[PDB]
Design a protein around this ligand. Structure first.
Ligand SMILES: CC(C)=CCC/C(C)=C\CC/C(C)=C/CC/C=C(\C)CC/C=C(\C)CCC=C(C)C
Length: 357
């Protein structure tokens, strides 16, 4: 649960959003903000509620709030920035999946997929999804930076779908530097991935494991550490053997070649053959799932305004507003689970059994 002055912050964030979306609310008892005055109401509302998939609305907003240390103005500024930069580009990326990338012959993206440069390999000890990155497979010439970035965004988004109920909604990254050479170094995607987690995926990082760093990496590290904010810097751990990795990941999830028990094929990529995509063009059922969502979003907005202006926080009526918000939250996440087979092309992880939405 949340404290009173925390509840106030969360309500003020919702109130700024509601003034942008023309949802009637009175914020006095707990005129569009500068951060939102240059956004399109319709576009923002629609994109915001598409990007909510498996997380409740409150949790999605609270990620931005904590990342900005519970300062309401800074939180609404970061959130407006994100909404401006996201539009519908990332949702298109995750919904088209690897299939769209192949169908439109995006050669650089494809080479990153086929090299298995970044792959979700299971969960860490807190049930966060774990991304295995192997920089020794990287060559700046293999792709454009835009392709590299589109691939990175796709992998990040995929790992968001692995987030478990009642477990931290964040991704751990294992950087295996075995066989890393300057041949492989590329400061540009480092910078992008620092910049993009900082402004677009608040509170989405769990652990940053840097495994068997060779000596040539220490000067590079002296640069990269300068670019990090202190919380991301707090997340980084250097490990040198499998016993150290064991403290963060269960042996069933660590690749065999690292000392673990995971016998996944890391040298041969198996793209999604598309045979689980049958619901992608049941258009009418999709439309009925999306109408359910539209109604559940309207109700959520309604009750959330109610809960914003209601005084006091003792009240039995307040108890009912809170419980209704939680049940509408639950209903929205279940509705997204139902909608998932109908908008999203299946990933290699839906096929190999590892992912269930
Ligand atoms: C999804 C993902 C993380 C990867 C996309 C593909 C890329 C960018 C892989 C290549 C990585 C690379 C070329 C690195 C060279 C050596 C550098 C490092 C191991 C340090 C880079 C990582 C960091 C520790 C930066 C700060 C952390 C984050 C993620 C914000």
């Amino acid at each position: 649960q949340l404290t009173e002055d925390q509840e106030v912050v969360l309500k003020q964030i919702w109130t700024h959003l509601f003034h942008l979306w023309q949802v009637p609310v009175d914020g006095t008892h707990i005129k569009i903000h500068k951060a939102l005055a240059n956004l399109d109401p319709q576009t923002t509302k629609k994109q915001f509620w598409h990007d909510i998939k498996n997380e409740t609305p409150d949790a999605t907003i609270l990620k931005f709030i904590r990342a900005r240390k519970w300062n309401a103005d800074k939180t609404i500024a970061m959130l407006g920035h994100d909404l401006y930069w996201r539009k519908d580009t990332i949702n298109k990326i995750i919904n088209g999946g690897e299939r769209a990338v192949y169908e439109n012959n995006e050669t650089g993206v494809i080479k990153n997929l086929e090299l298995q440069k970044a792959t979700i390999q299971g969960y860490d000890n807190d049930m966060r999804p774990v991304i295995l990155v192997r920089p020794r497979l990287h060559h700046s010439s293999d792709q454009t930076e835009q392709e590299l970035e589109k691939f990175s965004l796709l992998v990040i988004e995929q790992s968001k779908l692995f987030f478990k109920e009642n477990y931290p909604a964040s991704t751990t990254i294992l950087f295996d530097l075995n066989g890393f050479s300057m041949s492989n170094m590329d400061y540009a995607p480092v910078k992008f991935l620092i910049t993009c987690f900082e402004a677009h995926y608040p509170e989405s990082l769990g652990h940053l494991l840097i495994h068997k760093a060779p000596w040539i990496f220490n000067p590079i590290w002296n640069i990269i550490k300068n670019w990090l904010d202190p919380v991301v810097a707090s997340k980084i751990v250097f490990t040198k053997n499998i016993d150290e990795l064991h403290k963060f990941i269960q042996p069933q999830y660590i690749p065999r070649y690292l000392g673990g028990e995971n016998d996944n094929d890391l040298d041969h990529y198996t793209p999604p053959d598309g045979s689980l995509d049958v619901h992608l063009k049941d258009t009418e059922t999709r439309a009925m799932i999306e109408k359910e969502r539209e109604e559940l979003v309207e109700q959520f907005l309604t009750v959330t305004a109610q809960w914003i202006e209601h005084q006091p926080l003792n009240d039995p009526a307040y108890i009912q507003l809170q419980e209704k918000r939680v049940q509408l939250s639950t209903a929205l996440c279940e509705n997204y689970s139902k909608l998932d087979p109908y908008i999203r092309s299946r990933s290699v992880y839906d096929y190999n059994g590892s992912l269930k939405v």
